[PDB]
Short mmCIF file of all heavy atoms in Angstrom, two decimals:
data_model
loop_
_atom_site.label_atom_id
_atom_site.label_comp_id
_atom_site.label_asym_id
_atom_site.label_seq_id
_atom_site.Cartn_x
_atom_site.Cartn_y
_atom_site.Cartn_z
N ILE A 1 0.51 5.83 5.96
CA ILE A 1 1.77 5.19 6.32
C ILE A 1 2.13 5.41 7.78
O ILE A 1 2.82 4.57 8.37
CB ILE A 1 2.95 5.63 5.43
CG1 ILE A 1 3.30 7.13 5.55
CG2 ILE A 1 2.66 5.32 4.00
CD1 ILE A 1 4.48 7.49 6.48
N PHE A 2 1.68 6.51 8.38
CA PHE A 2 2.04 6.81 9.75
C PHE A 2 1.15 6.10 10.76
O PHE A 2 1.59 5.84 11.88
CB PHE A 2 2.01 8.33 9.99
CG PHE A 2 2.51 8.74 11.35
CD1 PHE A 2 3.87 8.69 11.64
CD2 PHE A 2 1.63 9.21 12.31
CE1 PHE A 2 4.34 9.08 12.89
CE2 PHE A 2 2.10 9.59 13.56
CZ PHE A 2 3.45 9.53 13.84
N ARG A 3 -0.08 5.77 10.38
CA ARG A 3 -0.92 4.94 11.23
C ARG A 3 -0.70 3.46 11.01
O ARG A 3 -0.94 2.67 11.93
CB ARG A 3 -2.41 5.28 11.02
CG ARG A 3 -2.98 5.13 9.60
CD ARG A 3 -3.68 3.79 9.37
NE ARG A 3 -4.71 3.51 10.35
CZ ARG A 3 -5.95 3.99 10.30
NH1 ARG A 3 -6.32 4.78 9.31
NH2 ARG A 3 -6.82 3.68 11.25
N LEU A 4 -0.27 3.06 9.83
CA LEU A 4 -0.03 1.66 9.52
C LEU A 4 1.19 1.56 8.62
O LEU A 4 1.26 2.23 7.59
CB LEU A 4 -1.26 1.04 8.85
CG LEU A 4 -1.34 -0.46 8.63
CD1 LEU A 4 -1.27 -1.18 9.95
CD2 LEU A 4 -2.64 -0.80 7.91
N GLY A 5 2.15 0.73 9.01
CA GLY A 5 3.45 0.71 8.37
C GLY A 5 3.42 0.19 6.94
O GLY A 5 2.40 -0.22 6.40
N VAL A 6 4.61 0.19 6.33
CA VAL A 6 4.77 -0.25 4.94
C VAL A 6 4.63 -1.75 4.78
O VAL A 6 4.63 -2.25 3.65
CB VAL A 6 6.13 0.15 4.36
CG1 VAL A 6 6.31 1.65 4.40
CG2 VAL A 6 7.24 -0.55 5.11
N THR A 7 4.50 -2.50 5.89
CA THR A 7 4.17 -3.92 5.84
C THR A 7 2.77 -4.18 5.29
O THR A 7 2.46 -5.31 4.93
CB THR A 7 4.29 -4.53 7.24
OG1 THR A 7 4.04 -5.93 7.18
CG2 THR A 7 3.32 -3.88 8.21
N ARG A 8 1.91 -3.15 5.23
CA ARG A 8 0.67 -3.24 4.48
C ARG A 8 0.88 -2.88 3.02
O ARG A 8 0.15 -3.38 2.15
CB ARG A 8 -0.37 -2.34 5.15
CG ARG A 8 -1.78 -2.42 4.59
CD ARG A 8 -2.09 -1.24 3.70
NE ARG A 8 -3.50 -1.22 3.32
CZ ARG A 8 -4.03 -0.34 2.48
NH1 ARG A 8 -3.28 0.61 1.94
NH2 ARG A 8 -5.33 -0.40 2.19
N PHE A 9 1.87 -2.04 2.71
CA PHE A 9 2.10 -1.67 1.31
C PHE A 9 2.87 -2.74 0.56
O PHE A 9 2.34 -3.36 -0.36
CB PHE A 9 2.83 -0.33 1.21
CG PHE A 9 1.93 0.86 1.33
CD1 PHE A 9 2.45 2.13 1.30
CD2 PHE A 9 0.55 0.71 1.40
CE1 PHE A 9 1.62 3.23 1.37
CE2 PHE A 9 -0.27 1.81 1.49
CZ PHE A 9 0.27 3.07 1.48
N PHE A 10 4.12 -2.99 0.94
CA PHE A 10 4.89 -4.03 0.28
C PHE A 10 4.52 -5.42 0.76
O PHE A 10 5.03 -6.40 0.21
CB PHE A 10 6.39 -3.80 0.46
CG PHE A 10 6.90 -2.60 -0.27
CD1 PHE A 10 7.26 -1.45 0.42
CD2 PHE A 10 7.05 -2.62 -1.64
CE1 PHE A 10 7.73 -0.34 -0.25
CE2 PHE A 10 7.52 -1.52 -2.32
CZ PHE A 10 7.87 -0.38 -1.62
N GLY A 11 3.67 -5.53 1.77
CA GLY A 11 2.93 -6.75 1.99
C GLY A 11 1.81 -6.83 0.97
O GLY A 11 1.03 -5.88 0.81
N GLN A 12 1.73 -7.96 0.27
CA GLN A 12 0.76 -8.15 -0.80
C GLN A 12 -0.49 -8.85 -0.31
O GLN A 12 -1.04 -9.71 -1.00
CB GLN A 12 1.39 -8.92 -1.96
CG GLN A 12 2.17 -8.07 -2.95
CD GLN A 12 3.46 -7.51 -2.39
OE1 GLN A 12 3.68 -6.30 -2.37
NE2 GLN A 12 4.33 -8.40 -1.91
N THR A 13 -0.91 -8.53 0.91
CA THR A 13 -2.27 -8.83 1.35
C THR A 13 -3.23 -8.14 0.40
O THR A 13 -3.29 -6.91 0.36
CB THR A 13 -2.49 -8.35 2.78
OG1 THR A 13 -2.35 -6.92 2.82
CG2 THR A 13 -1.46 -8.97 3.70
N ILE A 14 -3.99 -8.94 -0.35
CA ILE A 14 -4.75 -8.45 -1.50
C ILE A 14 -5.89 -7.53 -1.08
O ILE A 14 -6.35 -6.70 -1.87
CB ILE A 14 -5.24 -9.67 -2.31
CG1 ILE A 14 -4.09 -10.62 -2.56
CG2 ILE A 14 -5.73 -9.27 -3.68
CD1 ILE A 14 -4.52 -11.96 -3.11
N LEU A 15 -6.30 -7.59 0.18
CA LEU A 15 -7.36 -6.75 0.73
C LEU A 15 -6.82 -5.33 0.85
O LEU A 15 -6.48 -4.84 1.93
CB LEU A 15 -7.76 -7.31 2.09
CG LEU A 15 -8.05 -8.81 2.02
CD1 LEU A 15 -8.12 -9.41 3.41
CD2 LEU A 15 -9.35 -9.05 1.28
N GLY A 16 -6.77 -4.64 -0.29
CA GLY A 16 -5.97 -3.44 -0.42
C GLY A 16 -4.54 -3.77 -0.81
O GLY A 16 -3.59 -3.42 -0.09
N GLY A 17 -4.36 -4.45 -1.94
CA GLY A 17 -3.10 -5.06 -2.29
C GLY A 17 -2.08 -4.12 -2.88
O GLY A 17 -1.79 -3.06 -2.32
N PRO A 18 -1.50 -4.49 -4.02
CA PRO A 18 -0.50 -3.63 -4.67
C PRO A 18 -1.07 -2.43 -5.40
O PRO A 18 -0.33 -1.75 -6.10
CB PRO A 18 0.15 -4.60 -5.67
CG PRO A 18 -0.92 -5.52 -6.01
CD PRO A 18 -1.72 -5.73 -4.77
N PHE A 19 -2.37 -2.15 -5.28
CA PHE A 19 -2.94 -0.94 -5.83
C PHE A 19 -2.81 0.25 -4.89
O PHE A 19 -3.35 1.31 -5.19
CB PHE A 19 -4.39 -1.18 -6.17
CG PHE A 19 -4.57 -1.94 -7.42
CD1 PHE A 19 -5.59 -2.84 -7.56
CD2 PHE A 19 -3.65 -1.82 -8.43
CE1 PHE A 19 -5.74 -3.55 -8.73
CE2 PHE A 19 -3.79 -2.53 -9.59
CZ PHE A 19 -4.83 -3.39 -9.74
N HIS A 20 -2.11 0.09 -3.79
CA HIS A 20 -1.75 1.22 -2.96
C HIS A 20 -0.29 1.58 -3.11
O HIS A 20 0.19 2.45 -2.39
CB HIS A 20 -2.07 0.93 -1.50
CG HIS A 20 -3.53 0.80 -1.22
ND1 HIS A 20 -4.38 1.88 -1.17
CD2 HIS A 20 -4.30 -0.29 -0.98
CE1 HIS A 20 -5.61 1.47 -0.92
NE2 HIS A 20 -5.59 0.16 -0.79
N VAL A 21 0.44 0.91 -4.00
CA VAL A 21 1.80 1.31 -4.31
C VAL A 21 1.97 1.71 -5.77
O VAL A 21 2.97 2.38 -6.09
CB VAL A 21 2.80 0.20 -3.95
CG1 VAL A 21 2.66 -0.19 -2.50
CG2 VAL A 21 2.62 -1.00 -4.84
N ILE A 22 1.05 1.34 -6.65
CA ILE A 22 1.04 1.93 -7.98
C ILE A 22 0.60 3.37 -7.91
O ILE A 22 1.23 4.26 -8.49
CB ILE A 22 0.12 1.11 -8.91
CG1 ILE A 22 0.65 -0.30 -9.07
CG2 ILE A 22 0.00 1.75 -10.25
CD1 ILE A 22 -0.31 -1.19 -9.78
N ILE A 23 -0.47 3.64 -7.16
CA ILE A 23 -1.07 4.97 -7.13
C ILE A 23 -0.15 5.96 -6.43
O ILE A 23 -0.17 7.15 -6.75
CB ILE A 23 -2.46 4.88 -6.48
CG1 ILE A 23 -3.26 6.14 -6.71
CG2 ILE A 23 -2.38 4.55 -5.00
CD1 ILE A 23 -3.66 6.35 -8.14
N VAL A 24 0.70 5.50 -5.52
CA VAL A 24 1.64 6.42 -4.90
C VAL A 24 2.81 6.67 -5.84
O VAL A 24 3.32 7.79 -5.92
CB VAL A 24 2.09 5.86 -3.54
CG1 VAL A 24 3.07 6.79 -2.88
CG2 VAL A 24 0.89 5.69 -2.66
N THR A 25 3.21 5.64 -6.59
CA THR A 25 4.18 5.84 -7.66
C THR A 25 3.61 6.74 -8.74
O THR A 25 4.34 7.53 -9.35
CB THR A 25 4.57 4.49 -8.25
OG1 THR A 25 4.93 3.60 -7.19
CG2 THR A 25 5.77 4.63 -9.15
N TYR A 26 2.29 6.67 -8.95
CA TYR A 26 1.64 7.58 -9.88
C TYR A 26 1.73 9.02 -9.40
O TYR A 26 2.06 9.92 -10.17
CB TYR A 26 0.18 7.18 -10.06
CG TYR A 26 -0.53 8.08 -11.01
CD1 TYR A 26 -0.34 7.95 -12.36
CD2 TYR A 26 -1.40 9.06 -10.56
CE1 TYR A 26 -0.99 8.76 -13.24
CE2 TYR A 26 -2.04 9.88 -11.43
CZ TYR A 26 -1.84 9.73 -12.76
OH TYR A 26 -2.49 10.56 -13.63
#
């Protein structure tokens, strides 16, 4: 998150999509 903002997380660019916000919620 500090090298690349949350616009990659809550951005649903599928190339690393919403599976980087389930696992952090996990």
Side-chain angles (χ1 to χ4, degrees):
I1 64 99
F2 186 73
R3 59 96 54 82
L4 189 61
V6 301
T7 183
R8 186 258 188 184
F9 278 178
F10 291 107
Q12 276 69 237
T13 63
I14 310 169
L15 309 166
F19 283 145
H20 294 285
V21 304
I22 297 171
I23 194 68
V24 180
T25 310
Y26 181 77

